[PDB]
């Protein structure tokens, strides 16, 4: 029970970290084909600076 | 690590084909002999593009 508790805590872990990854970390899992698809940028990369 | 460098070269490639094509304008009717035009063609190479 301890092992599966601390499973869960560590996969939520990995998809938060994976959530800020690509291109500019955002709602990427879509974002991507939304974004090149059109000829437009991420608002987000546009202010990553 | 290997998505982000294939984005990148994508995003270059991109910036230098639109960089050189702004520049292609002004050599736009040119007089010379013949020739009436010039023009610098970018392209990517099929063996790299894969």
Request: glycine share 6%; proline share 1%; aromatic share 4%.
């Amino acid at each position: 029970v301890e092992r599966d508790e601390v499973a869960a805590q560590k996969r939520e872990l990995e998809k938060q970290i994976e959530r800020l990854s690509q291109p500019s970390g955002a709602e990427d899992s879509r974002m991507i084909a939304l974004a090149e698809r059109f000829g437009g940028v991420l608002l987000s990369e546009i202010y990553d600076d | 690590s290997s998505k982000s460098v294939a984005n990148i070269i994508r995003k270059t490639i991109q910036r230098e084909q639109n960089r050189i094509r702004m520049l292609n304008q002004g050599l736009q009717a040119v007089s010379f002999g013949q020739v009436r035009g010039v023009r610098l063609n970018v392209n990517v190479r099929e063996s790299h593009a894969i």
